[PDB]
Amino acid sequence: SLVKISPQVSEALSNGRAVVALESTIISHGMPYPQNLQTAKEVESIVRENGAIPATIAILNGVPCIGLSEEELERLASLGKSVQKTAGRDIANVVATRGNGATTVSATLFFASMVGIQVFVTGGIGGVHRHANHSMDISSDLTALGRTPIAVISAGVKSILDIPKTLEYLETQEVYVAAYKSDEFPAFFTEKSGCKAPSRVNSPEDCARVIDANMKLNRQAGILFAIPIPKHHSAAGNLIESATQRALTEAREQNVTGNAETPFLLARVNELTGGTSLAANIALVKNNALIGSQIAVALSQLMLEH
Amino acid sequence: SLVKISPQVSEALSNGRAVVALESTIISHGMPYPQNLQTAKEVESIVRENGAIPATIAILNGVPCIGLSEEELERLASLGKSVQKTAGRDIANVVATRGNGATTVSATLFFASMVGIQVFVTGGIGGVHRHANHSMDISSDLTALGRTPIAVISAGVKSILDIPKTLEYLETQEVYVAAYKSDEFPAFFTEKSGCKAPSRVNSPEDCARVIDANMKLNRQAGILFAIPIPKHHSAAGNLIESATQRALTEAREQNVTGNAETPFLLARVNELTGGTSLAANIALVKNNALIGSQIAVALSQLMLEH
Amino acid sequence: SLVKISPQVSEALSNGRAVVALESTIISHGMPYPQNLQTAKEVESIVRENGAIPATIAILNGVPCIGLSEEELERLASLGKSVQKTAGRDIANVVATRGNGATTVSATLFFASMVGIQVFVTGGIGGVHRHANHSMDISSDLTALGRTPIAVISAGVKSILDIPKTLEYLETQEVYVAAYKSDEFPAFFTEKSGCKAPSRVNSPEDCARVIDANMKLNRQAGILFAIPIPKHHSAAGNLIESATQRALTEAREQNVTGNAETPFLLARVNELTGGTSLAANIALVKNNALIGSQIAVALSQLMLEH
Ligand SMILES: [Mn+2]
Ligand SMILES: [Mn+2]
Ligand SMILES: [Mn+2]
């Protein structure tokens, strides 16, 4: 009764119809207003055009909202960076303080699974940070997915993170990880992570069959589908990856360590590449929304045929 | 039906009244009998005077007891160090062998949450040990709190442990961590850990609002509130911290490693400081009982107003 | 309705009678057909002779089977190595693709616990790999047991793995670990791991009392019983351990690291020792089946006496 579900989303959920959850970060960190709103509308339209209902999730004035109205999407967008970045562990505090929160992967998948949404489209997922051996800095996204039965549709893991260790951690958490139409696990900006995909899926229908099986089994762990960046944005992605490897090199040369390591890398990449990173992120989210919506629709067919 | 709940505690729980869980360690390792009993009575009295019901938890002759009678508290106290230190994973064995067990944070929070107690007052919580990178020695307290929806009221984490890594681990487990009336996460004996508080709460009512939100959301992860040592015991705490840093230094100089590392540190500190450590621990538990009881009462008001 | 339970197993479960779960690996990697089938029959017969019902678990043509018919055991055995090694996170994919899967400890304990089987006999359990500090390579067996209330009957952990870190990890996951009739935690092939047992049990009845307590408490974490290799196979085990320590030495000398480390060790041991490893594994599984069946029967008595 604390959570507000939009009528479009609740009616779809009642009848087993396709719903795609979305997080509130394309909005809080996009282009200058009202361009971030326009991007959010464009992503929701991709979901709608493919036959699913988009369920953008955010917290507004302490109210968790699953499915946003036009007014709510506008309000969220005009707030811009002023919203609290809200991980799962932050939800109760944002509710208690009646704040506005843009939910991360861990928080969004909590709310999506709470109400029975099976497919959550994101950009990337958090992971094991570089030099986690000394810091233990590991995203709660990985824990959350290990104990929430939901499918996350991502473009992989950023090379700023430790991708091999992220994959190992996901194995240990019992998360099924599959690359989409590839034997290589994608990094976010490049298809080349250097890591073999632990498993492979080749169509939205393949994906839906795995989700359907997971639901029928009542497993409490989730699924990560990783969709490699489209070749039409490989130039933008390759630029970011080149800048990232340069930043990593400069970081080593200047002995940047500890809590300053990750923010230094992020900082240096933006100077070299400006807006191309956001452009790549938007292209990735839009690709994930397309394939994620097809997965959700294929799943609703399997559910109908039960 | 295995667990025995005292009539005072069960009647309070039936009516949504304030209850504070307590562990059985102030007793098993306090001053010489009957001084450890007197300390336990003093802590329970602080809870009672503030309008809550104290629920001390222990296992006696294989019977988990939630809420102790006068006879039971006396019996437990006279046993002294003879009781098994009982972590969550030890409970079944202590029950099976019909033993006596003093429950740790992980075991106490299991029993407290089992019966619907929302607030558990402790001294400190276990954590990531120093050089866990080589040992993986990490307290089950952290795991337990990550999957039990209960608030633990603590004075932070001892500097004998690795506080930065403990904080990271708690983030990954989706535990909401907040310092009380400070931007700094407290170490146990000193307010100065060197780590920023990941979040802050400024009153018992703030705390209760977070717990209330967590309950309404049906989140399965818990909450750590960390209350800095009162200035009136900072001298005792500073002495312990000084002795701890000296022991850490001597440990490095004598290359103490592995399973001998943590017990060496504990051993050296006691020689230098004698009884002041226990005095500091008692002051901390009594402070946590005061604030914890106020939190529990404020929470019972929120629940009444639902 | 996706899972097929044999009539013998379902009738036993309905009436609280002794059932022992078994995994499908003695079969997929045993002696040349039909010798692997004969070994599987021999293990099931040990369970039957001791008064319990054997429940071998596998996935055949996408159907999870709990309890195999004569035809199914034969079919599984004739498939040999062609079956997918199926961890818990792989189950949904094997079901979705209608494949054949030999379930590992993590997958088998999921299915066993799903239907109410309390005792699962295996050979060994997976663990923390050597140099996990750099790789984070850790078996999902440990996670799975930390959140599944079932008893696993094993002969310990292989010295190819990092046994001290595996024990620490199990503590953190809240898994009760006990050595059978010893103060030393067994390695798989040798009773000498160099690690003290965190706890000890001295009879099948002791084991059953712990399981019974765990069930009554409704704890969601499981139990690992580790049974040291019988002295009558210590020569075979000692040979394997000697070969393992030699392989470890050669690995260090040739600087084998990363993802090549574990497979190199496994590879070298087989060249030096040929079939004695399988012989030792079979002896261990058969010993675990004997004691595991006694535990299951003793537990069914406790349940009858409730
Ligand atoms: Mn982090
Ligand atoms: Mn420990
Ligand atoms: Mn592994």
Please report which ligand is nearest the Cα atom of B139.
Answer: 2
Residues 6 or more apart whose Cβ sits within 8 Å of residue A231: none
- Nearest CA among A198, A262, A261, A194 for reference residue A224: A198
Using CA atoms, how far apart are residues C187 and C169, in angstroms rounded to an integer?
16
Q: Phi and psi of C119, rounded to 5°?
A: -130, 125
What does B265-294 look like in DSSP terms, one character per residue? HHHHHHHHHTTHHHHHHHHHHHHHHHHHHH
Resolution of the PDB structure in angstroms: 1.5
B173 Cα: distance to centroid of ligand 3 (angstroms): 21
CA distance C112 to C119: 8
Q: Give the SS3 label for residue C154.
A: strand
DSSP state of A192: -
Nearest CA in chain A to B206: A96
Three-state SS at C24: coil
Closest C-alpha to A217, from C69, C25, C63, C67: C63
- CA B132 to chain C, closest CA, distance in angstroms equals 9
Instruction: Give the residue carrying structure tokens 């160099």.
Output: C194
Output b/e per residue, B230-250; b: 16+ Cβ within 10 A.
Answer: eeebbebbbbbbebbeebbee
Q: Which member of B146, B171, B176 has the closest CB to residue A93? A: B176
Query: A253: which 2 tokens?
Result: 């040369």
- Among B128, B213, B192, residue whose Cα is nearest residue B162: B128
Q: Which chain C residues touch B96 with a CB distance below 8 Å?
A: 206, 209-210, 212-213
Packing angle, helices C261-273 and C276-304, rounded to 10:
110
Structure tokens at A93: 């505090």
How many residue pairs from chains A and C have C-beta atoms closer than 8 A? 73
C104-108 contact pairs (CB < 8 A, 24+): C104/C23, C104/C25, C104/C141, C105/C23, C105/C139, C105/C141, C105/C144, C105/C145, C105/C152, C106/A174, C106/C139, C106/C140, C106/C141, C106/C143, C106/C144, C107/C23, C107/C57, C108/C21, C108/C22, C108/C23, C108/C24, C108/C57
- C110 to A219: CB separation less than 8 angstroms, yes or no: yes
CB contact under 8 A, B133 and C128: no
Residues of B near A (CB-CB distance < 8 A)?
A: 128, 132-133, 146-147, 164-165, 168-169, 171-178, 199, 206, 209-214, 216-219, 221, 223
Say whether B135 and C164 touch across the interface (CB within 8 A).
Answer: yes
Contact C104, C60 (CB under 8 A): no
Say which amino acid occupies B74: E
For residue A261, CA distances in Å to A139, A160, A249, B94, B197 come to 15, 10, 12, 46, 20
Residues linked to residue A102 through DSSP beta bridges, in sequence order: A85
The helix (run of H) or strand (run of E) holding residue C239 is helix C234-253
Q: What does the alpha-carbon distance between residue C276 and residue C242 come to, in Å, rounded to a whole number?
A: 12
DSSP state of B81: G
DSSP-derived secondary structure for C244-268: HHHHHHHHHHTT--GGGHHHHHHHH
* Residue A231 bears catalytic tag: no
Which residue from A2, A134, A147 is facing B217, i.e. has the nearest CB?
A2
Structural domains in chain C plus CATH codes: 1-117 (3.40.1790.10), 118-306 (3.40.1790.10)
> B19-22 and B200-201 as β-strands: parallel, antiparallel, unpaired?
unpaired
Up-side HSE of residue A167: CA atoms within 13 Å toward CB?
A: 24
Residue type, B125: I
Ligand at shortest distance from the CA of A128: 1
Q: Is A286 annotated as a binding residue?
A: no
N residues, chain A: 306
Residue type, A205: E
Which of A2, A89, A142 lies at the smallest CB-CB distance from B175?
Answer: A89
- Chain A residue at shortest CA distance from B171: A140
The set of chains that have 3 or more CB pairs under 8 A with C is A, B
Look at residues B34, C26, C93, B50 and name the one whose alpha carbon lies nearest to residue A223. C93
Q: Are the C-beta atoms of C76 and C111 separated by less than 8 Å?
A: no
| Total residues found in chain C within this entry | 306
Cβ-contact B136, C168 below 8 angstroms: yes
Annotated binding residue C94: no
Q: Please name the method used to determine this structure.
A: X-ray
Which pair of tokens denotes residue C297?
């029967």
Torsion of CA B72, B74, B77, B79, to 10 degrees: -80
Count CA within 13 A, CB hemisphere, residue A180. Answer: 24
Q: Are C156 and C210 in contact (CB under 8 A)?
A: no
Sign of the C-alpha dihedral computed for residues C90, C92, C97 and C101 taken in this order? positive
Tokens of C173: 């996951």
Token duo for residue B102: 């003093």
Q: What burial letters (b/e) apply to B195-212, b meaning 16+ CB within 10 Å?
A: bebbbbbeebbbbbbbbb
**Local structure of A242: helix, strand or coil:** helix
Type of residue at B84: Q
Determine the residue of chain A that is closest to B163 in CA distance: A135
| CA B93 – CA B144 distance, rounded (Å) | 18
- Alpha helices, DSSP H only, in chain B? 7-14, 25-28, 35-49, 70-79, 91-96, 105-114, 132-135, 140-146, 163-172, 204-217, 234-253, 261-273, 276-304
Mapping DSSP to helix (H, G, I), strand (E, B) and coil, where does residue A78 land? Answer: helix
In degrees, rounded to 5, the angle at the alpha carbon of residue A288 between the alpha carbons of residues A122 and A264 is 50
- From CA C148, how far away is CA C219, in angstroms rounded? 9
> What string of DSSP letters covers B138-176?
B-HHHHHHHTS--EEEE--B-TTB-HHHHHHHHHHTT-E
- Residue C137 annotated as binding? yes
| A105 among annotated binding-site residues | yes
Distances (CA, A) of A65 to A6, A196, B136, B227: 8, 38, 40, 33
| Whether the Cβ atoms of residue A108 and residue A55 lie closer than 8 Å to each other | no
Gap between the Cα atoms of A146 and A221, Å rounded: 5
Q: How many CA atoms lie within 13 A of A272 on its CB side?
A: 18
User: Is B88 in Cβ contact with C174 (below 8 Å)?
Assistant: yes
Ligand nearest to the CA of A126: 1
Q: Is C141 annotated as a binding residue?
A: yes
- Nearest alpha carbon to residue B48 among B37, B56, B59, B36: B56
Question: Is residue B149 reached through a cis peptide bond, with omega within 30 degrees of 0 on the bond before it?
Answer: no
Phi, psi angles (nearest 5°) of residue C225? -100, 130
Chain A: nearest CA to B11, how far in angstroms? 27
Nearest CA in chain A to B196: A259
